[PDB]
Each structure stands twice: as structure tokens, then as C-alpha cells.
Design a protein around this nucleic acid. Structure first.
Ligand SMILES: [Mg+2]
Ligand SMILES: [Mg+2]
Ligand SMILES: [Mg+2]
Ligand SMILES: [Mg+2]
Ligand SMILES: [Mg+2]
Ligand SMILES: [Mg+2]
Ligand SMILES: [Mg+2]
Ligand SMILES: [Mg+2]
Ligand SMILES: [Mg+2]
Ligand SMILES: [Mg+2]
Ligand SMILES: [Mg+2]
Ligand SMILES: [Mg+2]
Ligand SMILES: [Mg+2]
Ligand SMILES: [Mg+2]
Ligand SMILES: [Mg+2]
Ligand SMILES: [Mg+2]
Ligand SMILES: [Mg+2]
Ligand SMILES: [Mg+2]
Ligand SMILES: [Mg+2]
Ligand SMILES: [Mg+2]
Ligand SMILES: [Mg+2]
Ligand SMILES: [Mg+2]
Ligand SMILES: [Mg+2]
Ligand SMILES: [Mg+2]
Ligand SMILES: [Mg+2]
Ligand SMILES: [Mg+2]
Ligand SMILES: [Mg+2]
Ligand SMILES: [Mg+2]
Ligand SMILES: [Mg+2]
Ligand SMILES: [Mg+2]
Ligand SMILES: [Mg+2]
Ligand SMILES: [Mg+2]
Ligand SMILES: [Mg+2]
Ligand SMILES: [Mg+2]
Ligand SMILES: [Mg+2]
Ligand SMILES: [Mg+2]
Ligand SMILES: [Mg+2]
Ligand SMILES: [Mg+2]
Ligand SMILES: [Mg+2]
Ligand SMILES: [Mg+2]
Ligand SMILES: [Mg+2]
Ligand SMILES: [Mg+2]
Ligand SMILES: [Mg+2]
Ligand SMILES: [Mg+2]
Ligand SMILES: [Mg+2]
Ligand SMILES: [Mg+2]
Ligand SMILES: [Mg+2]
Ligand SMILES: [Mg+2]
Ligand SMILES: [Mg+2]
Ligand SMILES: [Mg+2]
Ligand SMILES: [Mg+2]
Ligand SMILES: [Mg+2]
Ligand SMILES: [Mg+2]
Ligand SMILES: [Mg+2]
Lengths: 46, 271, 93
RNA sequence: AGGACCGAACCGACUAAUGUUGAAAAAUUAGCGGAUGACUUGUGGCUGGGGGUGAAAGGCCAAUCAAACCGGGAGAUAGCU
RNA sequence: GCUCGCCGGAAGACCAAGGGUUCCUGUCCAACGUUAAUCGGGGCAGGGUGAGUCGACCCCUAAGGCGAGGCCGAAAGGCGUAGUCGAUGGGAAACAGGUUAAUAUUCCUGUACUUGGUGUUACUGCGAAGGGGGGACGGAGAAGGCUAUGUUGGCCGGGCGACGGUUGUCCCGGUUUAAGCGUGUAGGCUGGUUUUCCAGGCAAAUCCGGAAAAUCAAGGCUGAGGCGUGAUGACGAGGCACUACGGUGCUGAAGCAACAAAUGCCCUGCUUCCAGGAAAAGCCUCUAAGCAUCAGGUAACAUCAAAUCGUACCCCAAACCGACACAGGUGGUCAGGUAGAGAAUACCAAGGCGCUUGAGAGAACUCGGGUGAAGGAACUAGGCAAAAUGGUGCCGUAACUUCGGGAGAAGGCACGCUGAUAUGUAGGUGAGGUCCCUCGCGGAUGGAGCUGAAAUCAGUCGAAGAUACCAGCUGGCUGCAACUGUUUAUUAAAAACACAGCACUGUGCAAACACGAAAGUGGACGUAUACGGUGUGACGCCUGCCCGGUGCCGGAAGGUUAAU
């Protein structure tokens, strides 16, 4: 059966990558939160 | 010519084709083509704003000359063409200076016919004039509403407008709706009726034929749940409401025109 | 013209292997580890200056570092660049 | 010619049996329907939660839907256990 | 290693996506592997990915995104112009052979090609952010011409048979060779050339478009394949010699023809239909400002350059998506033989596998199958399930019908093999020869050779000739829905939804309507033969009565009635 996760790196980076996050104020707040928590990986980019 | 299909399959039994052998069989005139990609009835928010639009055949946009401004220079009709973008056929016309244009094809116009625009033009079908220079009583089409703006009224297959009166700055027109409406006499009009009057006689014959034209299905309000439409709900076929639109406005006789700005120019409503 | 400073950085080591050995004997080709940002032009220039040979052509590839475990702790070796440098016939290095 | 016919690929899911701590959180086997079209499929795009989308089943919107998920108001309130 | 079995439009091969070292070699067997494990996609170490031509990057745009100014919005922001991004599409160029444990159109051998920079020489109107051409496009169908490929023959090498026979009309194997360059064919399209003029192509234009002459009628464009060359080469059955017995090294015959033949190519063609079928750049061409015997252009020759990143490996799967070495899911390409209409199906080839617990036993019962006396739906809610029917040709075929259908109605007959007709027919293909010949990839004639149905007659074997696999059960009455479609992913596929058709109604264009504090946007680059909403639902015959209620439309004498 087809399951929900059908990986595409291009779609991954466009939807959730660093530059998508930087593009909006809400996206920049995601990054602010994840820095404040001290995540080793801010985004799907790495 | 209107031709009934023979019932060699259920989907053909009720098809009635309108087959015009005059129409150019080749490709259209490429300098006057543009892309028009489809909307699906979605606006720039990406939301559906007109339901029931989607798919259908790809279509190139032909640049049609509704202004008919090229005054004084005669043009000969090269060929009549199918236009996917509209009900009327169009005519490729060649000006004496070597410019080509598409016009709405009037009834009767054929390859070889001359046409001209401007005040000095002869009163014959295809000729465009200011309506001050057209005799009261004339049947016209592709009528401007504002001088210079280009034809807006009576463009659809088989339509036309009568100039019924002139009074000073204004002519009065009988529109196909039946509305009597005033328009400035400086507004241009083309003589004759829009061609392809057989257009209305086609019978699509099957569901798919509407789909080819980019019309998606209509789900009746009463086939839905209350959450979806005012008409929705009921154990079995119930109704028991005044018919309304999906947004709850009464849809059987309630008038929706609200334009005080243009009321002055309506002499008599279609009624 | 590449500067002699730059040329002195680009070549990092000779690369020792059976494939490298066969390359030298069969096809007069030395295999080098080179700086990761070294171009083919620089590697050619460097080999000609520093080894005093004549180079026919340079082929390069980037070797991706292996992931490893060192007491249940993931690490990764560095990517590095390998140059197959073909010398002209007669030249010896 | 055809939303034509029979029939593989392909798309589907009518019947039965199995399975039901499964081989599988929806399948397998044997049959079954469509199979040039209102067909089917790849890649990318757009529509966002009282919102979308819906050939309309309250269907679907990441194994979640008569109002998604995540975080917060938050130790809601609980004459109940 | 020898046998056996299984897949073979795949369970083989090559990819994209995704993964990321799983690849190869050595070594180890704790854990992992549903068992053992000396083995492994497991541990450890080492190795391994080579590009002007493949792909990315790059140039170009689609949907769409972002968006200087801008317009709009309490703030955040929204929309959008110029722009700028964005492939799933357009845009230069490489092939064969060889090679590694592991890469190869990347290394090597041989033979090519593309674009650009410099220079030299000759000749010369070059010049774009602009103009024009081109790029550049649908569905279906039909044939011709081809090739991939196969088959047979010839050729070459080998064979003479474990058991009757097998020196032959016998057996086995091989019989391969690219891009490029040259040639210009089946086919397809199109009249050509010169001159003069011109309200068009924002300006200009020698270009494009248009007009009028004159003259000539064959000129051009396009184009598969074939042939030649590439190739005195490469490859080559096999033999011979070492072996570190796994494999290396050496040499090398034939290398032709006929027939069949694609879903591939000619073909972005041709015919036809309506639902009328991207864009932009590269490319070609035209000039503008400008530049002037300069720059620049064209040609030839020489030389230089063509970076960077990807390249291992899996990829219908034990490596991706499913928590698993999970009967699931996953787009593209390749397409051998016999039978067959076939990519169905059966058996095979190349190749790949036997599915990571086995060994016994031969109870009940369960699962999946086979057969069954007599009966034949008595079973059951219900013929559920099973059984059955099943091909081709010919004959034959009812009601009813919208004249298409119903219909494969129903039902009947034939069917293998052998021989003859005919040592292989009708048909297809077509060599040599002969003649003509704008003398060629030509035409006519000519039929060798090759291939080859279908039928009839006669005979013949079996219980049975559509022998397997494969492959309609049929008929009668009736409800519902006209029909093909659609639907509750995962208990409902239906009479439900949709549908063509019908009607009412709104809507005069800055349309109604919808999304949206708005700007805007969709409706539509549409304009009443149009568009929205609502109900009904092919077609046929039709669609009655009631306007009090509630809506809607219209009215305006009077009553009542807001802010003020
Ligand atoms: Mg509608
Ligand atoms: Mg309707
Ligand atoms: Mg319902
Ligand atoms: Mg409601
Ligand atoms: Mg009822
Ligand atoms: Mg009632
Ligand atoms: Mg090289
Ligand atoms: Mg490389
Ligand atoms: Mg069909
Ligand atoms: Mg479904
Ligand atoms: Mg099945
Ligand atoms: Mg059918
Ligand atoms: Mg079928
Ligand atoms: Mg319900
Ligand atoms: Mg769900
Ligand atoms: Mg709620
Ligand atoms: Mg609180
Ligand atoms: Mg609590
Ligand atoms: Mg088999
Ligand atoms: Mg590892
Ligand atoms: Mg391995
Ligand atoms: Mg042990
Ligand atoms: Mg074990
Ligand atoms: Mg390992
Ligand atoms: Mg701004
Ligand atoms: Mg914007
Ligand atoms: Mg844009
Ligand atoms: Mg771009
Ligand atoms: Mg692409
Ligand atoms: Mg390999
Ligand atoms: Mg051949
Ligand atoms: Mg096909
Ligand atoms: Mg590979
Ligand atoms: Mg297993
Ligand atoms: Mg699996
Ligand atoms: Mg598939
Ligand atoms: Mg098969
Ligand atoms: Mg048993
Ligand atoms: Mg049993
Ligand atoms: Mg049985
Ligand atoms: Mg019995
Ligand atoms: Mg019996
Ligand atoms: Mg009986
Ligand atoms: Mg009974
Ligand atoms: Mg009983
Ligand atoms: Mg049954
Ligand atoms: Mg059965
Ligand atoms: Mg016979
Ligand atoms: Mg009844
Ligand atoms: Mg139905
Ligand atoms: Mg269901
Ligand atoms: Mg079901
Ligand atoms: Mg408008
Ligand atoms: Mg109904």
C-alpha cells in the first residue's frame, strides 16, 4: 500500500528548508525557537 | 450545417453537430496568437470563485480586433476561422497596407469580401462606423459602450443590436436581452449580425462533451448535507425552504442589479 | 599564471594503492591526493613546477569520507580530492 | 466514427474463502468491472482549519476529521468515578 | 562440481526518484541474521567512483513563486509593475573495441565531432534592450518504404556417438563490426527568378507583409534506409601453452545470401475530425543610435580552451516508502525461440533464482486442491460456493426496437495427422539475363531462388483432434436508474451522485456572483446563441386545480414608525 511519506528532496527543501523558513516572519520564529531550544539541526537542510 | 449523429452508441444517439465547411482547416495565423492558460475558476488567492470550471481542451488566444480603428484603409477577407475562445467564428482580414487582423465574422461575410472602418465607410455588413454615421434602424454588432474602448455588446454567435433612435449625443439600442439602452452616438458599431447563428442548435449529447469545454459537474444543493448548502439535509428527498444560492440569497426571482451609476442609461429593462 | 604560493598548497600526498601502482606502470599516470578546492589547471601547474615533469592531462574525483564508529559514537572522515595525473611519454616520477 | 465491442498492460474493487496476537494497522487466492477516455500516470505548482477541496459519502485534508496537527490560555471545569 | 526444480513482458537487464558506502578485497562470528553459520547488506581494516561530448551547473522560458518603485491594509502584512527566479519542457558535440577485485560513451586503442578565445592571411558594412522568420507543438486513422530483430540456406570449424540406426536431404557451434565522413534514395512539402512600388511590422530596414509587372517553368527545402568508407583494423568458433588450477598468455577459419519482420525509424509526415491543440531562448535574418579605409563581419589556416559538481552500489527492491532481511507500494527504458491474434498463455534461451529453521511421521481437525455410485437445488435467507459454458469458420437466429440494436440471441455442422490436387497451390518476394536509359540508389521485361495460406478429394490413428495452458453458461417474466461515468481510502457501488436534455430565475459589463477590512483577483482577455444560481434528469406522451399561508416581483390612498 502507498504510505504517506513519499520522499522528494526538492519538495523537502522547498517546503521546510532553511530559505523557506527565512522567507517569512513566522518561519524566522521557528528558527528562533529552535535556536533557543538549542537544536543541533535547525532545518531539514542539514 | 446542423447534422444529427446516428445512434451507433448511447453517447452518440443525441449528438447534433454544427459543421461549417467554410472554416479554414489549417492552423491559425501565428502572429495573432497568444497563450491563455486555464484558471479552474480560481482567483489569485487560489480559491475557487466560480464553481464548475476545470479541464477541457487547451486553447490558444486569438487577438481579435474589437476596436476596428484602422479607418480609411480597405481590407479583404482572407479566410474564416474557428475560434475556441468564443461562440462566433472569426475572419482573418488583410488590409491594403499588408496588415492582417482577426475580426468577428458577421453573418454573410465570406472570403473575398471587402470591409472598411471609419466615418466614410459604406453601409454594408462588416463595415465599422460611429453610430452617428449609421442610419437609425440599422442592425449592428460589436458595439462600443464608450467611444474608443472597443466593442462590448452583441459579440456572441448570432447576436446583434438595433439602433432604434437617436437623440442628440445618444443613440438608443435594443439589446438581445430586450433591454432598451442609451449609448453615446460616437460609439462605433459594425454592420450586420454576428455570424454562426447555428451555434445554439448544437446538442452536446453526452457528459463528456461538456467536460471538453471545461465545465465540471453541478452538484444540486438538495443533494448535500446542511453544513454544505442551505438546501442540504433530510431523510429522503426533502426541501421545505425558499430556494437560495450556496450563500443563502434567494435564487428564484430576487433581483441583484445594484448600479445607480449606470441606471440613467437604461431606458427600459429587459422584463 | 597561478602563484607559487597557491601551487605549493594544492598537492597533499601521493596516493598509494594497487590501482595507483597499475596506473603508473600501465599508463604513466601518478595518483595524488590534492586540495579539495584544487582545479585541474592548478594540479597540472603544480605537478609541472614542483615535480619538474610534463603533464598530458589531469583527471580528478572527489572521494566521499566514510562514516565510522569509535566506541558507539558516529563520526565521518573528510571528503578529499584525488587526481589521476597523466604524464607525457618519457617523463618519470 | 465511437464516453462502441472482446481482451492483457494499466486503473479499479462486485463475490467468496483465507487471514483477524495477520505475511499485511485493509492484504492474499480464485473469480470480477473499466481498458481512446467524463481515461490513466510521472515531475513541479496552487487552495489551510469554521478554512480548503468534494460527479456530495459529512467524503478527504500525512494510519487523525460533524471542525486537522503542534504549542500555548492550562493545573479549563468535573455537584461525577 | 554434477544432477534436479523455479522465473523468463521476469523472479532477467539498465535507470530516474529515494537511500548513502550497502560496492570490492582481507579479516572476525560476540551482538545482528526468526536455526547453524566457516557465510552476510553484520563487526573491523584497507581499497574503489577518472568526462569538452553522459547528467548537473549553464542559456531559455511554463504553471507558479518572489518582487525596486507602486497600490492597499490598525501593526504584522496583502496584491502587483519593471524585473527576477522556477522543469516536468526548448537549447552544441562520441562512437566501437579493450581493460579493474571493484569505474568506464569518463581509463587505454582506434576513429571522430562541437563551441568558443587568440593569432595570421584574404575579402568585406558591422552594429540591439528593437523588427521579422524560425523554434512551435492536438486526437484518431491509414498505409507505403525501412531497420532493429529473427528464421532458413550457403560458408567455415568441429563431430561420426554409452542402446537399434546415424558419411548424410545427418549433428553441434560460429557466421560480428559503431559513430563519423562521403553519396542522396523510398517518401513529404513548396512553383521559381528578377524588377518596380507601398496608409503595415511604435523608429528604420535591403528583412517580413502587401501591390503590379516581366520571364522561366523545374528550382529549392526536407528525408528513413541502402551503398561506399571507417576497417590491410577490431572482434571471432576453437586450437595451442602456462595455472599462482581460480584464470592468464598466444594465434585465429568463415564472416555471405534469401525470406520474414516490429508497437522502432521515415513520420513534428500524410488523411481526417472537432473538443481547435505551451512559452521563451539558441538559431536565421533586418535594420536603429553608433562606428568609420577603425572596430566588427565572413572564410581558410594555426594554436589555445572547454572549468566546476555527479559518476561506487541497490533500484518492482533484504539497500527506496511500509517499526522488520515485512506475500504490500514504487515512474521510465530494453523485449530472444516454439506454439499463439497477442506484451495473453504454456514450455524454453540469455540471464537469474530454490524464497535463512530443518528432520521425521502419515491421527482427529483446519487450510488449498483432485475424483466420486444413485439422485440432481431436495441445500440455503439466497444455487453462497462449486460444477458448467468457453476457440475459429460456415450455416442459423425470436419478442421487442430509439432501426443502431436486441445478437456471440438461441441452436447446428466442421476441426488431428498423411497423401494428392500442387515433388509447395493462390498469394507475397524477387536474382540472373534481355532491352531501354534525363546513364542512376533508374525504367521495362523476365522469372531462378526464397517464402507460403486457404480449400477440396482420398486415406489414417485414438474413447476423445478448439485435446494441454488459454477460453462466453443460456433463456423467460418483472422493480429501479435512460445510457458510459462517480461515491462512503479501511464493513454500504446502489435505486445514491453526475450526466446530456428541460425549465425557472438572476445578470447590460466596472455584469450578476465569488475570494478578499482593502487593493485587487476569478467570472472573462468572455458580453445575453454569454455567464451565475436553482430544480428536474436521455427519449416518447405529457405536466391538471389552488396566489389564502410563506417567499419573490410590483404598487402607493391611508395607518404606524428611527436618527434628527
Ligand atoms: Mg455552474
Ligand atoms: Mg445542469
Ligand atoms: Mg447525503
Ligand atoms: Mg445552514
Ligand atoms: Mg420523505
Ligand atoms: Mg412536507
Ligand atoms: Mg581524458
Ligand atoms: Mg568528474
Ligand atoms: Mg469502450
Ligand atoms: Mg475509488
Ligand atoms: Mg484479484
Ligand atoms: Mg465494456
Ligand atoms: Mg474490456
Ligand atoms: Mg447522512
Ligand atoms: Mg486520514
Ligand atoms: Mg468546535
Ligand atoms: Mg485560565
Ligand atoms: Mg485537569
Ligand atoms: Mg518453467
Ligand atoms: Mg557500514
Ligand atoms: Mg558484497
Ligand atoms: Mg558458535
Ligand atoms: Mg545465530
Ligand atoms: Mg559488511
Ligand atoms: Mg515595496
Ligand atoms: Mg507579490
Ligand atoms: Mg514571473
Ligand atoms: Mg531564468
Ligand atoms: Mg528538465
Ligand atoms: Mg559494477
Ligand atoms: Mg536486416
Ligand atoms: Mg500501441
Ligand atoms: Mg554504475
Ligand atoms: Mg527472508
Ligand atoms: Mg518486500
Ligand atoms: Mg506500476
Ligand atoms: Mg506471462
Ligand atoms: Mg494429510
Ligand atoms: Mg480437504
Ligand atoms: Mg471436482
Ligand atoms: Mg456424484
Ligand atoms: Mg454419475
Ligand atoms: Mg438433470
Ligand atoms: Mg428449497
Ligand atoms: Mg429446507
Ligand atoms: Mg457463484
Ligand atoms: Mg469452476
Ligand atoms: Mg490437409
Ligand atoms: Mg414488486
Ligand atoms: Mg445507472
Ligand atoms: Mg467502504
Ligand atoms: Mg465494497
Ligand atoms: Mg471586468
Ligand atoms: Mg433527481
Amino acid at each position: 500500500m502507498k504510505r504517506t511519506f513519499q520522499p522528494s528532496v526538492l519538495k523537502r527543501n522547498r517546503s521546510h528548508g532553511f530559505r523557506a523558513r527565512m522567507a517569512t516572519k513566522n518561519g524566522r520564529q521557528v528558527l528562533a525557537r529552535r535556536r533557543a531550544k538549542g537544536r543541533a539541526r535547525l532545518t531539514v537542510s542539514k | 450545417a446542423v447534422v444529427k449523429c446516428k445512434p451507433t452508441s448511447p453517447g452518440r444517439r443525441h449528438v447534433v453537430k454544427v459543421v461549417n465547411p467554410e472554416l479554414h482547416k489549417g492552423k491559425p495565423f501565428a502572429p495573432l496568437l497568444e497563450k491563455n492558460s486555464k484558471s479552474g475558476g480560481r482567483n489569485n488567492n487560489g480559491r475557487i470563485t466560480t464553481r464548475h470550471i476545470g479541464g477541457g481542451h487547451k486553447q490558444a488566444y486569438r487577438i481579435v480586433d474589437f476596436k476596428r480603428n484602422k479607418d480609411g484603409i480597405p481590407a479583404v477577407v482572407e479566410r474564416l476561422e474557428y475560434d475556441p475562445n468564443r461562440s462566433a467564428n472569426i475572419a482573418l482580414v488583410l488590409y491594403k497596407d499588408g496588415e492582417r487582423r482577426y475580426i468577428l465574422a458577421p453573418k454573410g461575410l465570406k472570403a473575398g469580401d471587402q470591409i472598411q472602418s471609419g466615418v466614410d465607410a459604406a453601409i454594408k455588413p462588416g463595415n465599422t462606423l460611429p453610430m452617428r454615421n449609421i442610419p437609425v434602424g440599422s442592425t449592428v454588432h460589436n458595439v462600443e459602450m464608450k467611444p474608443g474602448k472597443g466593442g462590448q455588446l452583441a459579440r456572441s454567435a448570432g447576436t446583434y443590436v438595433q439602433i432604434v433612435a437617436r437623440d442628440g449625443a445618444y443613440v438608443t439600442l435594443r439589446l438581445r436581452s430586450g433591454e432598451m439602452r442609451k449609448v453615446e452616438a460616437d460609439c462605433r458599431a459594425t454592420l450586420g449580425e454576428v455570424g454562426n447563428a447555428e451555434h445554439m442548435l448544437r446538442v452536446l449529447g453526452k457528459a463528456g462533451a461538456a467536460r471538453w469545454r471545461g465545465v465540471r459537474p453541478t452538484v444540486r444543493g438538495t443533494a448535500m448535507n446542511p453544513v454544505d448548502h442551505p438546501h442540504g439535509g433530510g431523510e429522503g428527498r426533502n426541501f421545505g425552504k425558499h430556494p437560495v444560492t450556496p450563500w443563502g440569497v434567494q435564487t428564484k426571482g430576487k433581483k441583484t442589479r445594484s448600479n445607480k451609476r449606470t441606471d440613467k442609461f437604461i431606458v427600459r429593462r429587459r422584463s | 599564471m597561478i602563484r607559487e604560493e597557491r601551487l605549493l598548497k594544492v598537492l597533499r600526498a601521493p596516493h598509494v594503492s594497487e590501482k595507483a601502482s597499475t596506473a603508473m606502470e600501465k599508463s604513466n599516470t601518478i595518483v595524488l591526493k590534492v586540495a579539495k578546492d584544487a582545479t585541474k589547471a592548478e594540479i597540472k601547474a603544480a605537478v609541472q613546477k614542483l615535480f619538474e615533469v610534463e603533464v598530458e592531462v589531469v583527471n580528478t574525483l572527489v572521494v566521499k569520507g566514510k562514516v565510522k564508529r569509535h566506541g558507539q559514537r558516529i563520526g565521518r572522515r573528510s571528503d578529499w580530492k584525488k587526481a589521476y595525473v597523466t604524464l607525457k611519454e618519457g617523463q618519470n616520477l
